[PDB]
Structure 1
């Protein structure tokens, strides 16, 4: 509710800032009563393709938001996460309009909901369109929570059996990928509060304890305990982070 009024606020100012984009700001933000509508609009535009047009995607997204409204809530926490944690982002509207990490994340939620409902064929279709379109490959069966930030995002991979809990922050090229040719648990369970830096690779079914910090470039083959800074290739513990939840700080 409060986040949505700032978006609308910022939008009125931007509409005056840049005439070329007035109608854009009006179409994406100002014409909607609430965030859920701005989200279906944005997802429809960003996922649209000849095979499924915006208008048809929007029907699907609205279905999912009608059926599990906490998605909209999740996304509002995802907006707040970016605004504080990204010093490049000074506005509640920037993620919603412009940031592929945020878009991919919300597109994941739709495919997740679809997969919950056993609508696998669609979930997979979208998963892969999102890869091509936003350069983020998240399997719909992954369990991701609220207040997440995929900053820059180009190159993120997250596989079938992964979990990401609330208040996590991830960067470009991070892979929460698997090992083996065999189905079953083989993807990381990343716990509440973790930061992962650019170009980490975290493979197999391994915990990353509640509050840990995976350094940039790190390749993490073994479990990593809470409140620990892992790093190196492959990853040994070089540290303990400077805050309880290093996701909020981005050291």
Structure 2
């Protein structure tokens, strides 16, 4: 439920404001004064994406329009929160991704851009993509199709291209590229299927499959498709083993042979 995630967030916020007065005002503005997750999300995005061109209120109205049209984006955000809490041992609170984590922020900004792109507002979507690249150091093409329960841990240097697909329950670290090949339009970026874990620095290039439950080792350069439930590693990457679990995204085991 969104509600237990949101109820958890407010209760955390109440406690955190008591034991850190420096941030009491911060917690009230970002969390306590909102009635639901949607409103906290739009507030976060409005403030983080504000520019002279589109100030806070202007951005917020765009975000609220998107969430009214497609409320599943809020549900997706809630799943992404739970992903980080459950998978990242440095995070023990529901509020932490929403408050602090630039990978989470960039992911929700992408959802807005994707909605815009699909509505034909492509100029605005590209503006926001490239704003997010500068501000959060994550460059996700708004045409990319990205599911829910996604963790982008640390996130600096992540690149996801136009024709990429990232299914639900995927975990991706800093400096990961889901990148293209060639100079022509068309399908040319990876398809990352459910349960995949991608370690820091991995470059996955071209219109290639990374099958369900696969594991891509840190620093891998993947140029050929990786079968489901297999571990790939190296430069260029080869099949080196099989993961310890069905969904390595859940366990974040970085070892490979």
Provide the C-alpha distance between the structure 1 equivalents of 2:76 and 2:181, rounded to a whole number of angstroms: 30
Instruction: Report deviation, 1:10.
Output: 0.4
Any stretches of 5+ residues in structure 1 without a counterpart?
none
Q: Distance in 2 between matches of 1:203 and 1:138?
A: 15
Shift of 1:225: 0.2
Q: Please give the per-residue CA displacement for 1:54-86, whole angstroms capped at 9, x wherever unaligned.
A: 111000000000000000000000000000100
Q: Give CA-to-partner distance per residue, 1:125-169, whole Å, 9 cap, x none.
A: 000000000000000000000000000000000000000000000
TM-score normalised to structure 2 length: 0.97
Please report how far the alpha carbon of residue 20 of structure 1 lies from its aligned counterpart in structure 2 after TM superposition. 1.4
Aligned CA-pair RMSD: 0.4
Secondary structure, aligned partner of 1:238: strand
Task: Give, in angstroms, the shift of residue 17 of structure 1.
Answer: 1.4
The separation in 1 between residues aligned to 2:139 and 2:100, in whole angstroms, is 18
Deviation at 1:50, TM superposition (A): 1.1
Q: Structure 1: which 4+ aligned runs deviate by more than 3 Å?
A: none
> Partners of 1:20 and 1:238 in 2: how far apart?
50
Aligned-partner SS, 2:239: strand
Give the deviation of 1:23 after TM superposition: 1.0
Offset at residue 18 of structure 1 (A): 1.1
Structure 1 residue 220: deviation in Å?
A: 0.1
Structure 2: which 5+ runs fail to align? none
Structure 2 SS opposite 1:154: coil
Q: How does 1:86-235 map to 2 (within 5 A)?
A: 86-235=88-237
Distance 2:146 2:123 in 1: 20
Instruction: Work out the number of aligned pairs and report it.
Output: 251
Question: For 2:67, what is the secondary structure of its paired residue?
Answer: helix
CA distance in 2, matches of 1:68, 1:53: 23
